[PDB]
Each structure stands twice: as structure tokens, then as C-alpha cells.
Amino acid sequence: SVEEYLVHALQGSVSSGQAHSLTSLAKTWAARGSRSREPSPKTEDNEGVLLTEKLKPVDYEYREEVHWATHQLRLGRGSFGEVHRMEDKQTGFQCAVKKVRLEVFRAEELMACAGLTSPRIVPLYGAVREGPWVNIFMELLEGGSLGQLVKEQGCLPEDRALYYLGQALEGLEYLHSRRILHGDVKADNVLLSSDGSHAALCDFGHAVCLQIPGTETHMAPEVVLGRSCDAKVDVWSSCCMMLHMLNGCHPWTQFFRGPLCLKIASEPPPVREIPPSCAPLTAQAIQEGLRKEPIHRVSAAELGGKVNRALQQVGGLKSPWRGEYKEPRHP
Ligand SMILES: Nc1ncnc2c1ncn2[C@@H]1O[C@H](COP(=O)(O)OP(=O)(O)OP(O)(O)=S)[C@@H](O)[C@H]1O
Ligand SMILES: [Mg+2]
């Protein structure tokens, strides 16, 4: 085999290379983090690949507190990874690290963003393993997550919400054309620029190749029902994110108590959660993104077009970055 020979050359070392190298190696991490465990020797293994010259391995090694280190205060944490500020001790370059255990690592997280070039998808700088400790390096975005932004603001003005959905739908489309599902699209998983003008998709831990969902409130009915699933799952999730941005709360939550699987399958789509004060086009785009049958549901491309035109309808991006708190919809 050609790939299994290529992979062996990469193992035990951290190297400068390209996307396919990291991708192929990550597969072995995912398979490795499943064994019945072994007594650790004196040699804790150090391997991975670095995708940019801004992060340099010295003598085929790249270890924490030796070649690089984290900064004050964590940037955030989800259900699987802790993210910190990072500095390479030689280059002096600043970026982000996501810390993931080997036992929960999926190779699809790197397969989904390695080498890919889109302003709407966070650049991946590489990933290195220190035994059972996986470190995922990526571009640092200083504006925090959309989830942080919505928690602080309460909810977003119509134009702001549309503006970010549009950007997220541009990232979703880029992925779907490369036959990759996101899996966990929500406000926590979209990063923002310092000035708030740029949004980028992050967190591909629930990614899956085309031909497990991330968040219950954002699950499409066809996932819940155990039916067949395609890229349309991300577009449903993105409209659940949209309602979260408009209302300041996740869908379903202010109406039902968990588990919500039954409700998502049994109830009509949560189109009643669209604020009545929204523009006709805004409400229309959400309604067709929240179509229960994925076949009759619009693609990321079709939805992106509809939200751009809806943004034009409300008069473009006019609302200020940050600004006044808007009281979330009352339960
Ligand atoms: N590059 C980054 N710059 C700034 N903040 C980040 C960055 N990456 C992640 N964060 C923040 O840290 C949080 C956790 O990172 P995620 O990548 O979402 O990990 P996770 O939620 O455990 O992934 P899952 O659950 O496997 S889908 C995010 O919600 C962001 O708020
Ligand atoms: Mg996350």
C-alpha cells in the first residue's frame, strides 16, 4: 500500500508539509485512540505536521513548554476542546491551540479544514500529538465567537444576524462542494474578527464526508428520526442559529423541556419563533431553510442568495459593532 507506507514515514516525527500529510496521519490517531491502553514507556511520542512556516519544528520535534507555550486565560471551551492563545518560542508568531484528548479525536476535524482556502473557514496551521494529547493549531480570531457576541448583546439586530448567516452560508457552501458536512453549526462555532466584520466557521469535530450531531437544539428532523442525512442538515442548523441570533435563545428551549428529539420530529418546523417584526424576505429565507424534508429544503447556496437579498431589503449592514443590549424573548 502507498498511503500506509507514506504514513509510516511521518510517524514519530513532526514535519513541515501539506494537507494530505496531516490528514493521512490523523487517521492513525483516531484509530489509535481506541486501544485497550498500554503502560507508558520513557518515550512519550511526538508527531504531527505543520502547514505553515510560521510554526517551525526544531529537529523534528514540537512540544509544549519547549518550542511553544500558551498565554493567559483560555479563549473558550466546548464539549471536546479547550482553546488557548499560543506563541512559538522561535518565530514569535501568535495563534490558537485547541487541546483534544486522543480518545475523543476524530480525523474528520482536520480533513474538513486542512488545505482549504476560504475567508469563511478558519485556516488550519497544523496539528501535533504529544502522547495522548492532541494540539490543533489555527488562526487566532480576536473578536470571540458569535455565541459570545449574542450572549453579551442579548440578541442581534436583523441586519447583523443576516450578515453573519450569509458569511456562514458561504463557508457551508464551500464545504458542501468538497463533499464535507459540518455537523455542529451554531453561534459558538463561528468566530468573529476584532472589528466584527469577518466571520469564519470553526470546530469541525462533528464533520463527516459525503458519498453524530453536535447540538440537540440545532438538530434537523431527519437526523432525529434516524433517516438518511446529507448537507441539508447544516442549513437547518444555520437557521436554528439565525433564530438564536434574533431571539437571544435557542429554538425549542423556551417552549419545551428535554429531551427535544421527540419535539423536533413531532412538531412543525419552529417558524413560529421568527419575530413578526422581521422583513418578509428574512422570514421567507428562514422558513425554507427550516423545511422538515431535506429534499424540499434549500441548499446553502440557495439560502445564501436569499439572505443577501434579505440584507438588501432591510437596507444593508447599518447596525453598529457591539452596541446596546436587546432584551431576549421572554419565556
Ligand atoms: N481560533 C479561535 N480563536 C478564538 N476563539 C476560539 C478559537 N477557536 C475556538 N475558540 C473558542 O473556543 C470555543 C471551543 O472551541 P471548539 O473548537 O468549538 O471546541 P468544541 O466545542 O469542544 O468542539 P466540538 O464540541 O467537538 S464540535 C469556541 O466556542 C470558541 O468560542
Ligand atoms: Mg464548539
Side-chain angles (χ1 to χ4, degrees):
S1 189
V2 61
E3 192 181 312
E4 287 163 17
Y5 171 77
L6 186 145
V7 162
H8 187 239
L10 293 163
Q11 290 186 76
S13 310
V14 22
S15 58
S16 300
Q18 275 154 357
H20 67 109
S21 304
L22 190 57
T23 281
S24 308
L25 185 67
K27 279 180 183 64
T28 63
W29 296 350
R32 207 162 197 274
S34 181
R35 258 175 269 190
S36 301
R37 287 157 288 272
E38 282 192 353
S40 59
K42 219 271 159 65
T43 310
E44 197 182 50
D45 220 354
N46 191 213
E47 53 177 42
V49 331
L50 264 27
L51 265 26
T52 175
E53 55 176 303
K54 289 167 275 188
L55 283 73
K56 297 184 196 302
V58 313
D59 292 59
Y60 299 93
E61 297 204 289
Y62 208 72
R63 299 179 192 260
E64 201 177 352
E65 289 177 15
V66 184
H67 317 288
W68 70 273
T70 64
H71 289 299
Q72 28 63 231
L73 228 180
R74 64 154 178 248
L75 296 163
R77 186 188 77 189
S79 282
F80 289 90
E82 296 203 66
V83 178
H84 294 87
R85 295 172 182 272
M86 189 272 211
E87 183 180 300
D88 187 330
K89 294 197 182 297
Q90 193 200 318
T91 315
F93 179 70
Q94 312 272 315
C95 73
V97 208
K98 186 181 175 157
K99 283 191 183 72
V100 167
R101 282 290 299 199
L102 232 199
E103 297 86 343
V104 303
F105 172 78
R106 290 177 71 254
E108 288 87 345
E109 182 157 12
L110 304 177
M111 287 166 73
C113 61
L116 277 71
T117 39
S118 166
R120 306 297 139 95
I121 291 168
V122 287
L124 183 79
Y125 296 159
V128 305
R129 215 195 99 214
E130 285 189 71
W133 307 101
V134 176
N135 306 107
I136 301 168
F137 315 115
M138 56 199 156
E139 191 179 74
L140 165 62
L141 284 152
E142 294 269 17
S145 77
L146 188 54
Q148 292 177 236
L149 201 254
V150 67
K151 183 176 164 63
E152 291 169 340
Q153 302 297 125
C155 52
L156 305 192
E158 196 175 356
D159 61 344
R160 276 279 165 189
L162 285 157
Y163 182 72
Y164 291 129
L165 218 211
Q167 294 198 235
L169 282 161
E170 285 169 25
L172 255 20
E173 178 197 308
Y174 191 90
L175 282 172
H176 300 155
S177 62
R178 278 145 189 84
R179 303 297 286 165
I180 276 163
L181 198 275
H182 185 280
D184 194 31
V185 14
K186 61 173 182 188
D188 285 338
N189 292 339
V190 29
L191 270 25
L192 264 36
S193 293
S194 46
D195 62 334
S197 56
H198 290 246
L201 297 175
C202 82
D203 186 4
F204 306 92
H206 286 255
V208 40
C209 310
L210 300 161
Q211 287 183 8
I212 293 88
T215 312
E216 192 174 20
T217 53
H218 289 57
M219 283 178 69
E222 70 273 21
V223 188
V224 163
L225 286 157
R227 293 174 174 178
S228 196
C229 305
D230 59 5
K232 302 293 184 73
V233 174
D234 285 343
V235 322
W236 173 285
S237 296
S238 64
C239 289
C240 282
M241 186 186 74
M242 182 69 182
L243 291 178
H244 176 216
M245 280 188 282
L246 290 171
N247 291 305
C249 70
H250 286 213
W252 313 110
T253 59
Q254 289 195 184
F255 299 98
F256 304 100
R257 282 198 272 101
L260 297 159
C261 312
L262 206 285
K263 281 80 200 162
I264 295 159
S266 290
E267 295 287 314
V271 294
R272 63 166 186 182
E273 295 205 35
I274 300 164
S277 71
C278 288
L281 286 185
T282 292
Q284 196 171 316
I286 299 169
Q287 285 162 174
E288 279 157 349
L290 287 178
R291 225 78 197 272
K292 284 190 84 178
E293 172 60 54
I295 287 161
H296 306 307
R297 201 181 300 150
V298 291
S299 66
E302 291 162 16
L303 194 48
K306 287 192 185 293
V307 305
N308 285 324
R309 302 185 282 267
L311 180 60
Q312 285 193 235
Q313 173 151 295
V314 297
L317 181 65
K318 288 168 82 183
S319 296
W321 176 230
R322 310 284 179 188
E324 299 293 358
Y325 184 81
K326 295 183 74 184
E327 184 65 30
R329 198 246 273 114
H330 294 277

